[PDB]
Amino acid sequence: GVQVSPSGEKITHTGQVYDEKDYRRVRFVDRQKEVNENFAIDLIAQQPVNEVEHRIIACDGGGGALGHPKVYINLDKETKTGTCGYCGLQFKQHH
Amino acid sequence: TSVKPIFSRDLNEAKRRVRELYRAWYREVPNTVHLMQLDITVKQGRDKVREMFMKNAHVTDPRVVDLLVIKGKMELQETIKVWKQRTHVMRFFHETETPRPKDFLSKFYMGHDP
Amino acid sequence: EMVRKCDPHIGLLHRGTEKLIEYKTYLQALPYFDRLDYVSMMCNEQAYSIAVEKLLNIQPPPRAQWIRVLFGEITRILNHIMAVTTHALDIGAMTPFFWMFEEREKMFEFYERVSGARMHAAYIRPGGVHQDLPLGLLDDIYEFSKNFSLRIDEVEEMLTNNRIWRNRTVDIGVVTAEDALNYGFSGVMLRGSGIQWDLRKTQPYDVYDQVEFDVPIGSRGDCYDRYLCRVEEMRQSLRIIEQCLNKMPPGEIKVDDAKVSPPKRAEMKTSMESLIHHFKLYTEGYQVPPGATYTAIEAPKGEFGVYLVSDGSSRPYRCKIKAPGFAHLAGLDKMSKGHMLADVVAIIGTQDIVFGEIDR
Amino acid sequence: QLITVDEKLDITTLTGVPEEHIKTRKVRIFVPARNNMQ
Amino acid sequence: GSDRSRFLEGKRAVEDKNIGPLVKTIMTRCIQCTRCIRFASEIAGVDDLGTTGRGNDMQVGTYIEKMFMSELSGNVIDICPVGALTSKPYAFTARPWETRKTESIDVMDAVGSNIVVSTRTGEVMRILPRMHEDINEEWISDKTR
Amino acid sequence: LHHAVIPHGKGGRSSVSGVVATVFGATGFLGRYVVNHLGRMGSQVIIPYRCDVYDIMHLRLMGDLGQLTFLEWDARDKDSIRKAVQHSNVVINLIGREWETRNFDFEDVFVNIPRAIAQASKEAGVERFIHVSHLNASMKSSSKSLRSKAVGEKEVRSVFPEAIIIRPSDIFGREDRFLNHFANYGFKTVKQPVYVADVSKGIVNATKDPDAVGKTFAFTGPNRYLLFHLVKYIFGMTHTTKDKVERIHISDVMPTDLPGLEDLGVQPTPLELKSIEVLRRHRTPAKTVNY
Amino acid sequence: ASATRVIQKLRNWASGQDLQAKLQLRYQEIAKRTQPPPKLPVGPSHKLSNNYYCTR
Amino acid sequence: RPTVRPRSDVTHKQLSAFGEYVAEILPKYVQQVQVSCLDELEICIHPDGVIPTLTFLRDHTNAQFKSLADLTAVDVPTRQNRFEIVYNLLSLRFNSRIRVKTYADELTPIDSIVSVHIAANWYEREVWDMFGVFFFNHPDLRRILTDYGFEGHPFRKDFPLTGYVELRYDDEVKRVVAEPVELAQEFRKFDLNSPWEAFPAYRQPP
Amino acid sequence: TYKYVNKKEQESEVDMKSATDNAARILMWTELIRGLGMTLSYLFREPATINYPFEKGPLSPRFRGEHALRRYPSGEERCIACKLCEAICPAQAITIEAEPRADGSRRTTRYDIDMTKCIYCGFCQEACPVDAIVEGPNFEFSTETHEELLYNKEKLLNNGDKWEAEIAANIQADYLYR
Amino acid sequence: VKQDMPPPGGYGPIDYKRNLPRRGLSGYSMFAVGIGALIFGYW
Amino acid sequence: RAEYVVTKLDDLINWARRSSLWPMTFGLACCAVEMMHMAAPRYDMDRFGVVFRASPRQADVMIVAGTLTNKMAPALRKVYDQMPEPRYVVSMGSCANGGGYYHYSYSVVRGCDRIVPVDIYVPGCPPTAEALLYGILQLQRKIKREQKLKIWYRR
Amino acid sequence: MELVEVLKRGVQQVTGHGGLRGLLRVFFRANDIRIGTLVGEDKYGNKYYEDNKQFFGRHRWVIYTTEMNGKNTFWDVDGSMVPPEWHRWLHCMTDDPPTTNPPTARKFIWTNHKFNVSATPEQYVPYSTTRKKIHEWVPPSTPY
């Protein structure tokens, strides 16, 4: 589920496909370009916002000994939301 | 400056100790090339040898020269015997790698090489 | 027909490890010491940690000291099995080799379960030990160790009264006692000629102080009395194991200080300070004091030791490894004098050329 | 015993370093800067 | 400092700001040091980055939404010893031990101030200043940063 | 040019030289040393193979970790050769054989196949089309092996003009078909052969020069030996079809104007100097003519 | 295992000691995989008082 | 106190007093016997008196140090005599160790100890291979660790990590030939040397 | 405690009772039988061989093998370009050049291993403060080319997009344990 | 609750010392058997 | 038919080839040791017709275990031009692949591939004996696929 | 008897694998006739038999099936197969197979394991995944 060059090659998470005038595409001849279709930027917007109570909380990555060191956030922005640089979750204040 | 001397005194006594070594390498180009086969006939092997002694003529210090004899004797002691191979003896020559332009004009068509 | 003068060409595997450590810090350089005595890993790490621990001035905790001795004399069992048998292969006996290398592969698994992998176990770090060892491990050593004092005497049935062994081996490479010290064998290759000596009892450092074990001296210097030393040193691990097994104290691992050991992975993840140290241990490291030591440890080879030299920068400054075989091999061309080819093979095995020590 | 000499004390022959990295190789001696972050 | 943070209660949080594209802000880790707000007031003459509030509840930054895009605004990054505020271009491109630092001179103004350049694998990631007591003094202007 | 064709990098073996190339017949004698003088200096040399993967292992080295790639094809297939050179600054054609098969003749191989490689190369935005016909090959030569080859020299220009052409004289090297022939068993047959690398360097040297954009070269070398003096000299040193043996006695030329080596960047090595190494596998100074 | 109560007497007569009890390899009653998860001990200086870095 | 490697004060005095025993008995060519907190002895001397202190230590009842363990060569390329060459011995009878180190330039050779300790037959030689420090009266000096055509002395701090040559097989000559050095990844020298001395009362004032 | 391995030579008045027992240990060979009849036992024992691809041997959940970049249970690549998973990598094996993600977030543009470097030492799986890099039970990833081991990142995700069914059970038995 | 792995008080003994069991008869029942069986040929 | 059968022959030509192959297992390093654990009972070689210690000059395959210095390399390649010329090659170890540790050192070669060809590269610092034993099988189908006469018929 | 009891036990070994095809297949396939209790039979046919009585390295053995993703896995049998839930059961890391305690779906894992592609197509090739790190110039097509 990726986007593709007009030359016909696969794009990564990053726009990375070689131009037409590029001898690098040789290495794909009689082979194929390995790529992960699981762009994080697509998966992450496909995740609902956790609309919690009090303005400040802790987050974790599903298991306190098992990811995402206990960073906090100030959820005063009613306009936007607050993120945690480890994960890509988002939060609101409920009020 | 009142240094400790080693194996000789002021240069012109160390210059015969040199010649004891050329006295061996000059007679051990033909023994190597036959015993362990090679490409050079005998001569350009001897040109290379003197081409190494006409690199270190710039020296002016007895201690340095009394040292450089030694490393020559080691390689001789490694060459007189078969401890080397056809790849070690024929390594000095720099046969393969292209010699870079010694001039200026061709020296920077490739390489940021001042 | 006969040998008089032999000359090795010890250079065929050098790598520049002593140089290559100078550009890497202590934690970043540990596993190079698994490589030297590639047969017996931990005992190298057992020394390298100490050369640090002296400078840093720390005794690691008992439970980590305690297990550091256990594997510290399972690695003893390895190299004997690797130079009892390979000393039999190149002499000719290929069978006990295979009888043991199932018994030896049951001895790697007890690294694989404990450490990450089988062989190059980066398990013994300067600050004690990285990681405790699991539940289904210590009920297993009992069964193994129980069945293992048989597997040896099972073999000693076969070889140590074997003509083809004995007269291939006896009177061979007669080493004079006071000449060994001139060469500094300082391992098996002198106790096998009656010089009563072992650092583990003559200069004890770890928890060896309470073990009640023995040193199998060899008289009548020859590579059969070296051999019997090499056998009985395998046996008298099991007295050490049984004593190193039935009184393990519950305690801590990876020394209490977070500056000399990484902290608990669940604890770096909430407690801030444990995070920072985790971010600087594994980038910068200990920041040793300047100083210098010459440690030592009798591995299967002998007095393996390190002349680690330090500086206030996190990285070392010309470590150096004392390869005990390095001196054993210099005596190769003096102990093979008035002896023919075929035993020179045996000389190699009864000098324990696990080259990686010899090579740098 | 001893010997007198006052010379430049060259060593460049005892290192390899064949021709390129002897002559055409400047060298900077300095006291490094304070990393202004820290 | 010690090994262990006996703190076990629960931290606080702080709002993030929108100064400008040069300077990111993570003011959840600001340490109330006052080493920034005394830069603008004594080296650049702005008086905008005040300290708002008291207690832990205090928080540096404007009371309002204003952009501190003036000369020498980038020197505030070298000053905040914490990585609270830092440079958006060198946001995450590298990490400092990875750098091979070369010391060189400013251009693009005729001052000829001095510089520490930060490389990474034959590339460039930052511009940083040296200390010469006569030229600039310790820092540089945002243009050549 | 683009961004990564650039020859920024010193020396070789991890460098770059913008000599991304497609040598076809480099599986036997000649092209392996070509790839050696390419792959050493840093040049992404493709090698199309149509043979055993084991017959190409000795090409895996002399190639620095990416600069040597491989892929499959067959000369009796349109557009595979095109696929092989969709990404080709340069093309090289070393194809050839000293004997006809049930499938391929002298005619099909030297002429019809380079014709398609020629057209194939021009259908992409290539620059150079280094071809290798052979010297002594105007037309009407006493054999058939050569009279076909010259047609390819005619039929390329009508496809891809401004193409380098090297018609060299006879080649000698280790594992050859020429000296080893004589070793393992006559006047008016005189021949100045050419060492291999002295051919290979020029080709590698010819794929970077500003000149050589259509000029037909001919690499000959010094020491125009006489056969009967030379064949015994081999015997003095060491101690089969129609169109090949017919090619032996044809060998007679003199250089009219042609460029040669020293106007390309080469010092030609004579025979006598590097002649023992190849005849060393058969163990226990000959007379020249200028004309 | 499948030792048919004769070869045991062939093994032992041919070798010696009763070695079905101290056999080479392992079958059972050992390392019953997935032992329970342990709550480790803690080291010292998790004591919250009289715990500086000066005394360590 | 648990985690400090207990000092064991007593043997400092043994190695200190014995450290004095060797000075006043041998005041020639002996400078600054010392000892670290780690109770291990160090004796700096002058190269002209190498053997007569070794032979005191191989041959004397109160210093039976008849077993050698190492002979290294430590670089300090900022002084004159950059190469600190180090000895280190052991008593089987007294159960202790020592360290007897010296100095040299790139050329101030040191007479060898092989008449005393033949254990140093090869330890001496690697230093010749690894630093280019000649020794007098050493039998059959020659390379050990380096190739038979390797110029240089690499454990010197002047010699780069990846040296000045890399080898390979150039098929045109059928040999393992050498040409200059051409990496693919460029070993990445880090600035892991933080500020903050970390060791006061242990440092260098200007 | 020092133990003489071989001290039995004592003149025991060697008589015909016993001195010929050595000659019974000789010409009528018995010690050789004793060394032979042993070996004959084993051929009637259970050979510990195993039919590898159909019978693979034992490991433990901490086996250091092939790397893989894990991922959170809700997409979202778990690696965040800390740049201490090379600063510790003694092989100097890694380059993890990075940027913002265009979401304002923080992730990579680059990640690397030369698996011909990468001693498989285990420093990176444990130094990673997030368990974003791990070192999983694959050890059948031998390839015919030195190039197919230079795992960049898309292989090393989609590898981590494969064994995550497995690693999250070994690690499930290895958290609260390191 | 803390259970990393201390053993139970025990784990018994284990042999450590050579236990070569002398089989093989005395030696008079070698020669007197052999020669006394050899001579069974010579009758 | 001709082409059908030669295909059915090459499946047999390359069978005797692979079903019993004679290595020249080098030592040189830690990496050496696992082959012996692969010569051991558990992951036995000999179950495949693979012989433990065969002479070099009659070998069919090489197995490079360990680091490869600039000193040993001629002593190595001298062997490779003494095998016959079905000689296949196997490079155990991260030190022979590209010099895993000591890539950057000076008495060391940055990959056995720098000197000799390679029919298979194998990872691991100590590649597990099994972790080779799949690779050795990967070799044992690297040539079950390759067809010598199938293409000679077209020659 | 004794001996015959083995053959009353060793005969179902042959006549316990269905017919003769089902038996003779196994023989040339793996040369392991051992009656095994089945627990598995994955997608694309991996059976994972078991018998606790044999020793520690043969109490679990897997019988691959033919017809992988177009490879004809009769002869050419790998170990890079055995996808990431039985691999952890087969190497004795754990006791419980992935039928009573399977792994946890995470809505991005693959649905079909791809084995160790050696030199075929559908394999890995390296990149330079760095976005070209420079931007040179463009001429204007407007002469002067």
Ligand SMILES: NC(=O)C1=CN([C@@H]2O[C@H](COP(=O)(O)OP(=O)(O)OC[C@H]3O[C@@H](n4cnc5c(N)ncnc54)[C@H](OP(=O)(O)O)[C@@H]3O)[C@@H](O)[C@H]2O)C=CC1
């Ligand atoms: N070597 C000499 O004595 C001289 C040679 N030349 C010319 O040099 C060139 C090199 O020939 P050389 O390399 O010396 O001899 P080779 O035997 O090495 O043949 C060269 C290549 O041509 C390939 N080839 C031949 N026919 C076909 C075909 N129909 N389809 C695909 N590939 C094909 C062969 O493939 P395979 O590898 O399967 O054989 C071989 O690799 C030829 O043009 C020859 O005429 C000129 C003067 C002297």
Ligand code: SF4
């Ligand atoms: S300098 Fe940094 S830490 Fe100090 S007040 Fe300013 S933002 Fe906060």
Ligand code: SF4
């Ligand atoms: S692997 Fe771990 S430590 Fe390395 S950059 Fe990613 S998250 Fe950070």
Ligand code: SF4
């Ligand atoms: S396992 Fe060790 S050597 Fe391998 S990548 Fe991780 S840190 Fe580097």
Ligand code: SF4
């Ligand atoms: S790869 Fe690892 S095990 Fe193999 S030789 Fe190198 S360090 Fe030793």
Ligand SMILES: [Zn+2]
């Ligand atoms: Zn989070």
